[PDB]
Design an enzyme around this catalytic site. Structure first.
Site, short mmCIF file in Angstrom:
data_model
loop_
_atom_site.label_atom_id
_atom_site.label_comp_id
_atom_site.label_asym_id
_atom_site.label_seq_id
_atom_site.Cartn_x
_atom_site.Cartn_y
_atom_site.Cartn_z
N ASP A 186 70.97 -3.26 55.37
CA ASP A 186 71.75 -4.14 56.26
C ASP A 186 70.83 -5.21 56.87
O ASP A 186 70.92 -5.49 58.07
CB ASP A 186 72.48 -3.30 57.34
CG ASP A 186 73.68 -3.98 57.99
OD1 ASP A 186 74.25 -4.93 57.38
OD2 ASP A 186 74.08 -3.53 59.10
N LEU A 200 75.73 -4.44 76.61
CA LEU A 200 75.17 -5.55 75.85
C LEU A 200 76.08 -5.94 74.69
O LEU A 200 76.13 -7.11 74.30
CB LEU A 200 73.78 -5.21 75.31
CG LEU A 200 72.68 -4.97 76.34
CD1 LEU A 200 71.42 -4.48 75.66
CD2 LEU A 200 72.40 -6.23 77.18
N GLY A 255 79.71 -2.52 68.95
CA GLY A 255 79.87 -2.68 67.52
C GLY A 255 80.95 -1.81 66.93
O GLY A 255 81.76 -1.22 67.66
N1 ATP Z 1 66.24 -2.36 71.23
C1 ATP Z 1 67.11 -3.33 71.60
N2 ATP Z 1 66.78 -4.27 72.52
C2 ATP Z 1 67.65 -5.23 72.87
N3 ATP Z 1 68.89 -5.34 72.37
C3 ATP Z 1 69.35 -4.47 71.44
C4 ATP Z 1 68.46 -3.39 71.00
N4 ATP Z 1 69.13 -2.67 70.09
C5 ATP Z 1 70.35 -3.23 69.96
N5 ATP Z 1 70.49 -4.30 70.77
C6 ATP Z 1 71.70 -5.14 70.84
O1 ATP Z 1 72.84 -4.40 70.40
C7 ATP Z 1 73.43 -5.04 69.27
C8 ATP Z 1 74.06 -4.06 68.28
O2 ATP Z 1 73.19 -2.98 67.97
P1 ATP Z 1 73.47 -2.15 66.62
O3 ATP Z 1 73.67 -3.16 65.51
O4 ATP Z 1 72.40 -1.10 66.46
O5 ATP Z 1 74.89 -1.48 66.95
P2 ATP Z 1 76.16 -1.61 65.97
O6 ATP Z 1 77.04 -0.41 66.21
O7 ATP Z 1 75.70 -1.92 64.57
O8 ATP Z 1 76.88 -2.90 66.59
P3 ATP Z 1 77.29 -4.20 65.72
O9 ATP Z 1 78.57 -3.83 65.04
O10 ATP Z 1 77.44 -5.28 66.77
O11 ATP Z 1 76.14 -4.42 64.77
C9 ATP Z 1 72.32 -5.85 68.64
O12 ATP Z 1 72.82 -6.97 67.91
C10 ATP Z 1 71.51 -6.28 69.85
O13 ATP Z 1 72.08 -7.47 70.40
#
Ligand code: ATP
Ligand code: A9W
EC number: 2.7.11.1
Length: 327
Positions: free
Chosen positions: A154, A43, A46
């Site tokens: 955040d 999906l 990050g």
């Molecule tokens: N429970 C969920 N259901 C659907 N999509 C999700 C869910 N959790 C996360 N995502 C998708 O994954 C993305 C990033 O999740 P998260 O922010 O927890 O990871 P990150 O390491 O911070 O990545 P980023 O740097 O993109 O923020 C979210 O923006 C969302 O699109």
């Protein structure tokens, strides 16, 4: 030196809860079985993880797997403990399981799946009513985590999942979240640039839950004024200048004076002198359908330099802006 600060609310939460509640280092992770989950598609990826859509093959339900990139052990246990403490809270993402990913050899957080409506579509189509409705759902999540002695740090659109079809909202990514301990000095390198509170921009480390309320105000301003992002800084310094061009420099100087903060000398050359702008100045024919006197008064009470003078999540829920929202 800087004058200390304490939150005006939920100051004692982590004191009157047992040590096991906030001492995330001592937490023993109860590992699930990675074989229960089948990865379907990536999906996103990050800075801290790789996120996948998956299937829990024990009940065939859609789940989300967040495989944590190798980072300090402390950061990982903190996210897990906070998710576990908050589990079942209103509009908080549900952590369903924790497994060891066989490929990365790191923890993989298993969450409930949210069918997130496209950000562009939501930004461009939410009505005045929907904005009030979803702001109220965010406030339920913020008041819950603040009452539980946790600050998100955040709050921004990317961290708010909206399944518009089912009017379902979830506050996600608790990776930067922290336990609030009165008198604790926190790292100011949190939140995304456009959402950073003035406390972070002026390097005041004794901040609290009220940082989330500034971030919330930033989200609201961009949405109702159709100005994305509302405070559009070119860097962390220009970010403060952008705020000062709206809120004015006199209240910024009052803020730094009250907390005995010394501004970084590089501000002397870029800050200038600015008067506070009346919120009605940002209204125009393309955003007038999202603005009202109640919306402006509410925004006014979130976007304040003094972190102690901002509405708390609970007071925000009592605001006339939400009178129209079906409860
Ligand atoms: N429970 C969920 N259901 C659907 N999509 C999700 C869910 N959790 C996360 N995502 C998708 O994954 C993305 C990033 O999740 P998260 O922010 O927890 O990871 P990150 O390491 O911070 O990545 P980023 O740097 O993109 O923020 C979210 O923006 C969302 O699109
Ligand atoms: C009520 C409200 C106010 C401002 C916003 O940007 C949003 C919002 C939250 C999450 C997403 C999807 N990630 C999109 C939007 Cl527009 C909601």
């Amino acid at each position: 030196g800087p004058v200390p600060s304490r939150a005006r609310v939920y100051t004692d939460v982590n004191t009157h809860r047992p040590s096991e509640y906030w001492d995330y280092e001592s937490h023993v992770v109860e590992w699930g079985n990675q074989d229960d989950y089948q990865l379907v598609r990536k999906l996103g990826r990050g800075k801290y993880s790789e996120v996948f859509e998956a299937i829990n093959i024990t009940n065939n339900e859609k789940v989300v797997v967040k495989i944590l990139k190798p980072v300090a052990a402390a950061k990982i246990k903190r996210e897990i403990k906070i998710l576990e403490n908050l589990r079942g809270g209103p509009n908080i993402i549900t952590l369903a399981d924790i497994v060891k990913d066989p490929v990365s050899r790191t923890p993989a957080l298993v969450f409930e799946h949210v069918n997130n409506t496209d950000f562009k579509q939501l930004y461009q189509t939410l009505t005045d009513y929907d904005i009030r409705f979803y702001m109220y759902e965010i406030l339920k999540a913020l008041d819950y985590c603040h009452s539980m002695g946790i600050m998100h740090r955040d709050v921004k659109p990317h961290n708010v999942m909206i399944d518009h079809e089912h009017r379902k909202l979830r506050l996600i990514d608790w990776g930067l979240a922290e336990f609030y301990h009165p008198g604790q000095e926190y790292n100011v390198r949190v939140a995304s640039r456009y959402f950073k509170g003035p406390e972070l921009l002026v390097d005041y480390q004794m901040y609290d839950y009220s940082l989330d309320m500034w971030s919330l105000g930033c989200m609201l301003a961009s949405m109702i004024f159709r100005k994305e992002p509302f405070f559009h800084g070119h860097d962390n310094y220009d970010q403060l200048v952008r705020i000062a061009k709206v809120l004015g420099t006199e209240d910024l100087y009052d803020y730094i004076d009250k907390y005995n903060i010394e501004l970084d000398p590089r501000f002397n050359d870029i800050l200038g002198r600015h008067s506070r702008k009346r919120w009605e100045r940002f209204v125009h024919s393309e955003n007038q359908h999202l603005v009202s006197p109640e919306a402006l008064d509410f925004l006014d009470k979130l976007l304040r330099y003094d972190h102690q003078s901002r509405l708390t999540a609970r007071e925000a829920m009592e605001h006339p802006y939400f009178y129209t929202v079906v409860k």
